[PDB]
Ligand binder design. Structure first.
Ligand SMILES: NC(=O)C1=CN([C@@H]2O[C@H](COP(=O)(O)OP(=O)(O)OC[C@H]3O[C@@H](n4cnc5c(N)ncnc54)[C@H](OP(=O)(O)O)[C@@H]3O)[C@@H](O)[C@H]2O)C=CC1
Ligand SMILES: NC(=O)C1=CN([C@@H]2O[C@H](COP(=O)(O)OP(=O)(O)OC[C@H]3O[C@@H](n4cnc5c(N)ncnc54)[C@H](OP(=O)(O)O)[C@@H]3O)[C@@H](O)[C@H]2O)C=CC1
Lengths: 414, 396
């Protein structure tokens, strides 16, 4: 009934709104983030439409002392981290210090990738496991023992992917298969903002997607490849044929560990050709580069010229479809299942005033938070969603805005 | 034997390089431009490989007295203008004042196209002639009588196009035809404002004593370029159409086409989409932020030439004269782009021919008015060998 939410961007705004819709679970919330004015505007926008009591504060979640002081002052039962993944460990340390629960949506990656202690563990991992993405669960899983000892719950990656995709996996394994062997996670965004080119997020993340090496997991080994070197096509329910490429994703790591006997796990994402050409163009004229220069570094000078940051929410027309195709065995017989959710952009902006990218992450975040606090998912330790009972989550998904679909004998990627 | 060179960008870098390779004609040269640092780096980079004595200076060729004081001080026999077209009139004035010769590569375009008295001249022209390009020869042709009286030579547009494309025309008229009727000029392949107006300015050509202006890039064609292949072409307006229509007797139609790769046309369309070509911290204009951004990675070839259709001994005849230059043999020789190379060499030849006596004629001239022969032998000699095709393939 008393919750502290850290961060106040797109995801947070959806998660906070859905939270105020279930005011009987959440009687009081505190919205703290780097720029307090964002917290205040959201409070303004929400106050009067909910019975939930909303307080706000400025907070630099990169400083644990500042985070601890806050928990100490507001006294919450849990902390929902909807800030950046850079703050994961700091917020987790404070939760342990003050004995409150932790929920987030993205795993940890250092903000400064030149930090000596971070490189040493990172480089060692690049040599041992085989994949070189800057983020992974190693740092957060390491809290397993201290959290279990403090009787604290740490629910990790509770958005859509990661998050729901793991809930889909657990659900599939509990009701449809005896053993899952192949998991292909397909993320499709078929929305049209109306502009020739525009970015939904921090424009440097877009650069990370198309340029970072892509990787997957196959029979106990990570497999890394040249960025965007694996292409495919799929006819997405309610959207259509879309070109999709294999990228690396957080959940592949937890899934490979938690789904017994699993043989291969891949994650693909859609990329329209105009978008792809628009961005090898921008990176060719070096407009995405970070090399500071004078006299302003460019990538964010571009951020200035591009369309309003978040004012694509009212403009965007289209749909997203994120799901998973499972191949496994039930009663000694091969079986394929596809579970997905189709989210419509304009329904998202009409309801909470955001795009579907924020919506599909925000809603699962609140549900993950609800189940932890209401007791359903309160277990000491650090957890990824596939390790918990999927049932109450799948119900909350139907109840709170993200109904799902299950298809037996679907169309395969290959 | 003594020359003042104004400007020190790409073209100038090539030109001076070529100039120093012929030190028996050019004993000492002076390299002066806005930023003296480049003049010095170029000077260090060359001297020791040449016996030509090299001096350098800072000069804002926009102020006429500063130019005159430099000419009076350095006492050169001629001035090669390889700065921007904005400095043409300023430099020609100094040349006339001090009695020295003049050579440039592009004709005049005012730097501030909003300046009142310029526009009055400009618009009057737009109404009479029919073409609206900001640049034209009228300004410089006006100097004809004064230069002739001072016994001075002003050679206009001595690059590839204009320039060599005009030498090709004079050559074709002298050796291959009795009369040229159709001239089609074909140019095949770091300033986005030049590229931007290149793809957006109205296109125009000349036909039967009249100019015809059309929608920008509304006219497309394709041609299989010798040594390069099939490429896409669009009709653009170009300087030499004006001089040729005046100087090629009986010519009936003159057109200019330029190639535009699909890869380039989209890059251009992408940049215009994210608003990087716009013109408007809250004190910046986009297109100039873009210039701040940008040798061996570049691979390819250029092919610039002209297709003439005419009459010789009462029979229609077609001729194709062109030059093929490859980017790296020129970057391996003088360290530059093929665009600067194909303009740099013509810039020197005209200068050499003007002051060694070959082309010294009092007055203002475009290249088609002079004997093309010494210029082409020179083109073969200094790096830009040409080709002649009888019965080549047409356009249309
Ligand atoms: N499938 C999934 O599950 C996905 C999950 N996500 C996750 O959700 C988060 C995205 O939120 P997103 O909508 O892009 O959020 P935004 O980038 O708009 O989030 C902005 C909020 O983070 C706050 N913040 C950042 N740094 C700090 C700090 N040091 N201290 C306190 N607050 C801070 C910001 O402060 P300020 O307002 O001043 O900038 C801001 O309010 C991501 O970290 C990402 O990992 C994203 C995509 C997919
Ligand atoms: N085929 C052809 O016939 C072609 C012709 N051209 C011609 O070549 C010239 C192009 O030179 P380009 O290679 O593009 O040159 P650049 O754009 O690199 O020329 C730069 C030089 O111009 C000098 N400059 C500019 N303004 C002044 C001034 N007011 N006073 C003194 N110096 C000045 C610059 O000084 P600084 O470096 O300090 O700015 C610099 O050295 C043009 O005039 C154009 O007409 C262009 C393309 C091909």
């Amino acid at each position: 009934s008393r919750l502290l939410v850290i961060g106040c961007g797109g995801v947070a705004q959806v998660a906070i709104s859905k939270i105020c819709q279930d005011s009987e679970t959440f009687t009081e919330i505190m919205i703290a983030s780097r720029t307090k004015s964002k917290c205040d505007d959201l409070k303004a926008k929400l106050e009067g439409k909910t019975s939930t009591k909303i307080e706000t504060a400025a907070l630099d979640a990169d400083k644990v002392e500042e985070v601890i002081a806050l928990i100490g002052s507001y006294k919450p039962e849990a902390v929902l981290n909807v800030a950046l993944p850079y703050q994961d460990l700091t917020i987790m340390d404070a939760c342990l210090a003050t004995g409150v629960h932790y929920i987030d949506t993205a795993n940890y990656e250092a903000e400064d990738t030149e930090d000596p202690e971070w490189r040493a563990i990172y480089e060692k991992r690049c040599k041992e496991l085989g994949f070189t993405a800057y983020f992974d669960y190693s740092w957060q899983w390491a809290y397993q023992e201290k959290f279990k000892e403090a009787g604290l719950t740490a629910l990790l990656g509770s958005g859509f992917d990661p998050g729901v995709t793991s809930v889909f996996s657990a659900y599939a394994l509990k009701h449809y298969f005896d053993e899952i062997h192949y998991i292909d996670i397909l993320d499709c965004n078929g929305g049209d903002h109306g502009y020739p080119f525009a970015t939904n997020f921090n424009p440097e993340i877009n650069l990370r997607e198309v340029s970072a090496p892509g990787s997957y997991w196959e029979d106990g080994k990570w497999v890394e490849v040249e960025a965007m070197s694996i292409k495919r096509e799929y006819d997405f329910p309610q959207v259509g044929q879309k070109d999709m490429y294999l990228l690396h994703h957080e959940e592949i790591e937890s899934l490979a560990k938690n789904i017994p006997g699993v043989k291969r796990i891949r994650f693909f994402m859609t990329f329209g050709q105009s978008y792809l050409t628009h961005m090898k163009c921008l990176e060719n004229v070096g407009l995405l580069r970070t090399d500071t220069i004078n006299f302003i570094v460019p990538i964010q000078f571009l951020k200035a010229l591009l369309p309003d940051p978040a004012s694509l929410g009212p403009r965007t027309v289209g749909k997203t479809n994120i799901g998973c195709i499972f191949t496994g065995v039930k009663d000694g017989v091969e079986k394929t299942i596809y579970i997905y959710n189709v989210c419509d952009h304009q329904e998202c902006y009409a309801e909470v005033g955001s795009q579907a990218i924020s919506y599909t992450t925000g809603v699962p975040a609140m549900i993950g938070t609800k189940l932890v606090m209401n007791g359903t998912w309160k277990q000491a330790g650090v957890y990824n969603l596939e390790e918990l009972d999927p049932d109450p989550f799948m119900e909350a998904l139907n109840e709170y805005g993200l109904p799902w679909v299950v298809v037996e004998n679907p169309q395969m990627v290959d």
